[PDB]
Amino acid sequence: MGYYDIDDVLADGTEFPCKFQYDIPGLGYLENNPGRPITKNTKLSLPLWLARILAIVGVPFVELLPPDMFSTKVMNAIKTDPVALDLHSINSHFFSLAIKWIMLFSEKELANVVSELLLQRAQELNHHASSLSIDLNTNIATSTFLLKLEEMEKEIYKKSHESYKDTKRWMFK
Amino acid sequence: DAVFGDRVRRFQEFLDTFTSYRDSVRSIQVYNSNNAANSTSLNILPHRIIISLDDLREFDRSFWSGILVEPAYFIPPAEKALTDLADSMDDVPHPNASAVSSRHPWKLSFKGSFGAHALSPRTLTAQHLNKLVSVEGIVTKTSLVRPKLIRSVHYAAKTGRFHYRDYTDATTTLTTRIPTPAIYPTEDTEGNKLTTEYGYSTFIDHQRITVQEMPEMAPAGQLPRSIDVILDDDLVDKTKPGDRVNVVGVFKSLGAGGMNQSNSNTLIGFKTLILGNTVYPLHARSTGVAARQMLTDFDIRNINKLSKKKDIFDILSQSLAPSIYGHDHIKKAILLMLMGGVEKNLENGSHLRGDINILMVGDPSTAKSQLLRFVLNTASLAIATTGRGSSGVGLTAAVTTDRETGERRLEAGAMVLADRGVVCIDEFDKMTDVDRVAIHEVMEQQTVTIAKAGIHTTLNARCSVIAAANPVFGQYDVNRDPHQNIALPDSLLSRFDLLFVVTDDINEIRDRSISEHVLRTHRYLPPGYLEGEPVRERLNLSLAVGEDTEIPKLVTIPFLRKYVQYAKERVIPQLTQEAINVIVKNYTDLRNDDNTKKSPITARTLETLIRLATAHAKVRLSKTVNKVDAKVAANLLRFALLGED
Amino acid sequence: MYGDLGNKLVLEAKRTKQLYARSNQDVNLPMYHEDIIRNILKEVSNLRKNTEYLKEQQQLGMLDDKVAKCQYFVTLLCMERNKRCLLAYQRLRTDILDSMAWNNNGLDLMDTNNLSHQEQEYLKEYCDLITDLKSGDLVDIDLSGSLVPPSDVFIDVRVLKDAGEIQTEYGVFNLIKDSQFFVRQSDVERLIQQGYLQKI
Amino acid sequence: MSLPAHLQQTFSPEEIQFIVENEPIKIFPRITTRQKIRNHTRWQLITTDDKALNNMVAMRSTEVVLWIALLLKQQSKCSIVAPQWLTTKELDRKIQYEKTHPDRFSELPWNWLVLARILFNKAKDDFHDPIHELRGKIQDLREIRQIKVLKGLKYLNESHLQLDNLSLLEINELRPFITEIMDKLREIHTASLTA
Amino acid sequence: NDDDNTEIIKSFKNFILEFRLDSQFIYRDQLRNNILVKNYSLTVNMEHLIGYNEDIYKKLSDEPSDIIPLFETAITQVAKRISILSRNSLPTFQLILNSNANQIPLRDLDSEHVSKIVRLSGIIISTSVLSSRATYLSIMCRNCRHTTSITINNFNSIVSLPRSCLSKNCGPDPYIIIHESSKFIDQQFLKLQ
DNA sequence: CACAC
DNA sequence: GTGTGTTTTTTTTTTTTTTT
Ligand SMILES: Nc1ncnc2c1ncn2[C@@H]1O[C@H](COP(=O)(O)OP(=O)(O)O)[C@@H](O)[C@H]1O
Ligand SMILES: [Mg+2]
Ligand SMILES: [Zn+2]
Instruction: Give φ, ψ of A119 to 5 degrees.
Output: -65, -50
Q: Do A171 and D117 touch (CB under 8 A)?
A: yes
- Indicate the residue of D102, D117, D143 with minimum beta-carbon distance to E82: D143
Task: Kindly determine whether residue C71 and residue A30, on different chains, have CB atoms separated by under 8 Å.
Answer: no
Ligand 2 centre to CA of B470 (Å) is 10
Ligand 3 centre distance from Cα of residue E147 (Å):
9
Range of the domain at C21: 1-146
C-alpha distances (whole Å) from B392 to each of B371, B385, B408, B470, B504 are 24, 11, 19, 21, 32
Closest ligand to the CA of E162: 3
* C-alpha–C-alpha distance, residues B103 and E43, integer Å: 56
CA E107 vs CA B567, C152, D63, E124: distances in Å: 68, 60, 72, 16
CB D48 within 8 A of CB D54: no
B368 annotated as a binding-site residue: yes
Residues near C65 by beta carbon (within 8 Å), at least 6 away in sequence: none
- Given a contact as 3+ CB pairs under 8 Å, which chains touch A? B, C, D, E
SS3 B422: strand
The residue among D105, D137, D141, D147 with the most chain E CBs within 10 A of its CB, best to mutate, is D147
Of E58, D153, B413, D113, the residue nearest A123 (C-alpha): D153
DSSP string, B562-624: HHHHHHHHH------HHHHHHHHHHHHHHHT-SGGGSS---HHHHHHHHHHHHHHHHHTT-SS
Contact B248, B134 (CB under 8 A): yes
Touch between A and B (at least 3 CB pairs under 8 Å): yes
Mutation pick from E19, E37, E82 vs chain D, by most beta carbons of D within 10 Å, is: E82
Experimental resolution (Å): 4.2
- C-chain residue closest to A4, CA distance: C88
Q: Helices E54-62 and E64-83: crossing angle, nearest 10°?
A: 130
How far, rounded to the nearest angstrom, does the alpha carbon of residue B179 sit from its chain's CA centroid?
37
**B350 labeled binding residue:** no
Determine contact, residues E160/B261, Cβ cutoff 8 Å.
Answer: yes
Chain A closest-CA separation from residue C30 CA (Å): 17
**What's the rounded Cα separation, in Å, for the pair B377 and B429?**
23
Burial class (CB in 10 A: 0-12, 13-18, 19+), D20: buried
CA–CA separation, B359 and B444 (whole Å):
14
CB hemisphere CA count around B458 (13 angstroms): 5
Q: Is B464 annotated as a binding residue?
A: no
A7: left (phi over 0), alpha (psi -120 to 50) or beta: alpha
Backbone breaks in chain E after residues (C–N over 2.5 Å): 87, 158, 167
Nearest residue to A67 (alpha-carbon basis) of A83, A85, A84, A91: A91
Q: How was this structure determined?
A: cryo-EM
Q: How near does any CA of chain C get to the CA of D52, in Å? A: 22
Kindly list the distances between the CA atom of residue B303 and the CA atoms of B118, B297, B312, B629, C25, in Å, as whole numbers in the listed order: 35, 10, 10, 19, 60
Considering only CA atoms, which of A114, A139, A112, A123 is closest in space to residue A83? A123
Neighbours of B298 (CB within 10 A): 8
Given a contact cutoff of 8 angstroms between Cβ atoms, the answer to whether B521 and B387 are in contact is no
Measured between CA atoms, the residue of chain A closest to residue D9 is A159
Nearest to D193 by CA among A107, C97, B79, E171: A107
What gap in Å lies between CA C175 and CA C165, rounded to an integer?
Answer: 6
Neighbours of ion ligand 2 (CB under 5 A): B 368-369
**Residue B123 among known ligand-binding residues:** no
Q: What is the DSSP string of D29-67?
A: -SS--------------SSS--HHHHT--TT--EEEEHH
Spatial neighbors of B430 by CB under 8 A, at least 6 apart, are B386, B387, B388
Cα E71 from Cα E45, distance rounded (Å): 14
Which of chain E's residues have a Cβ under 8 Å away from the Cβ of D132? 18
Calpha distance B329→B318 (Å, rounded): 9
CA B187, CA B100: separation in Å to the nearest integer?
A: 23
- Measured to protein CB atoms, the chain G nucleotides within 7 Å are 3, 8, 11-15
| B174 touching E (Cβ < 8 Å) | yes
Q: What is the DSSP string of chain A?
A: --TT-HHHHHHHS-EEEEEESS--SS--TTTT-SSS---TT--EEEEHHHHHHHTT----SEEEPPPGGGSHHHHHHHHH-STT--HHHH-TTHHHHHHHHHHHH--HHHHHHHHHHHHHHHHHHHHHHT---------HHHHHHHTT--HHHHHHHHHHHHHHHHHHHHHT-
Q: What angle do CA B19, B24, B30 make, to 5 degrees?
A: 125
Structural element, H or E, at residue E43: strand E41-45
Residue B483: CA count within 13 A, CB half-sphere: 9
Residues spanned by the domain of A142: 3-173
For every residue of chain C, which 3-state class applies, written as one string? CCCHHHHHHHHHHHHHHHHHHCCCCCCCCCCCCHHHHHHHHHHHHHHHHHHHHHHHHHHHCCCCHHHHHHHHHHHHHHHHHHHHHHHHHHHHHHHHHHHHHHHHCCCCCCCHHHCCHHHHHHHHHHHHHHHHHHHHCCCCCCCCCCCCCCCCCEEEEEECCCCEEECCCCCCEEECCCCEEEEECCCCHHHHHHCCECCC
DSSP code, position D76: T
Q: By the 8 A CB rule, do B167 and B183 touch?
A: no
| CA distance to partner chain A, nearest, from residue E79 (Å) | 15
Domain count, chain A: 1
Residue to mutate, B368, B370, B501, B512, ligand 1, most ligand atoms under 8 Å from C-beta: B370
Residues C154 and C69 reside in one and the same domain: no
Where would I find the beta strands (DSSP E) of D56-161? 62-65
Q: Count residue pairs from B and E with Cβ separation < 8 A.
A: 71
Closest CA to B413 of B461, B365, B373, B445: B461
- H-run or E-run covering B203: strand B202-212
* C186, C107: one domain: no
Angle, alpha carbons B194-B199-B200 (nearest 5°): 60
Burial class of residue C132 in the structure, from the number of CB atoms within 10 Å of its CB (0-12 exposed, 13-18 middle, 19+ buried): exposed
Q: Mind telling me how many Å the CA of E52 is from chain B's nearest CA?
A: 34
Helix axes D112-122, D13-20, angle to 10 degrees: 80
Q: Checking DSSP bridges between strand E190-192 and strand B161-166, what pairing results, if any? A: unpaired
Both C38 and C21 in one domain: the answer is yes
In chain B, which residues are followed by a C-to-N distance beyond 2.5 Å, i.e. a gap? Answer: 38, 548
Amino acid at D102: P
The response to whether B317 counts as a known ligand-binding position is no
Could you tell me which chain E residue has the CA closest to the CA of D141? E82
Are C103 and A76 contacting, i.e. CB atoms less than 8 angstroms apart?
A: no
Nearest chain E residue to D143, by CA:
E82
Length of chain D in residues, anyone?
195
Å between B181 CA and F2 C1'? 9
Q: Under 8 Å CB-to-CB from E144, ≥6 apart: which residues?
A: E165, E167, E168, E170, E174
Question: In chain B, what are the helix, strand and coil shares in percent, each to the nearest 5?
Answer: 35, 20, 45
Alpha carbons B514 and A87: distance in angstroms, whole number: 39
Q: What angle do CA B71, B74, B79 make, to 5 degrees?
A: 110
Q: Are residues C118 and C154 located together in one domain of the fold?
A: no
Q: What phi and psi values does residue B126 have, to the nearest 5 degrees?
A: -65, -20
What radius of gyration do chain C's Cα atoms show?
26
Q: Cβ contacts of residue C23 below 8 Å, gap of 6+?
A: none
Q: Return the residue in B52, B64, B113 with the most chain A beta carbons within 10 A, the one to mutate for interface testing.
A: B113
By residue count, chain A amounts to 173
Closest CA to C180 of C149, C155, C163: C155
Probe residue for ligand 1, chosen from B366, B373, B375 as the CB with the greatest number of ligand atoms within 8 Å:
B366
How many CB atoms sit inside 10 A of residue B347's CB?
5
Through-space distance between the first and last CA atoms of chain C, rounded to whole angstroms? 54
Q: How far is the CA of B432 from the C1' of G20 (A)?
A: 20
Q: C135 and C171 share a domain? A: no
A146 reaches B (C-beta below 8 A): no
Residues having CB closer than 6 A to ligand 1 are B 324-327, 362, 364-370, 468, 514, 518
Question: Who touches strand F, with Cβ under 7 Å?
Answer: B 181, 183; E 173
CATH code of B1-117, in short, is 3.30.1640.10
Q: What span, in angstroms and rounded, lies between the C-alpha atoms of B640 and E52?
A: 85
**Minimum-distance nucleotide, CA of B400 to C1':** G12
For chains D and E, CB pairs below 8 A equal: 27
Query: Do A164 and A127 touch, CB atoms closer than 8 A?
Result: no
- A80 shares contact with chain E (CB less than 8 Å): no
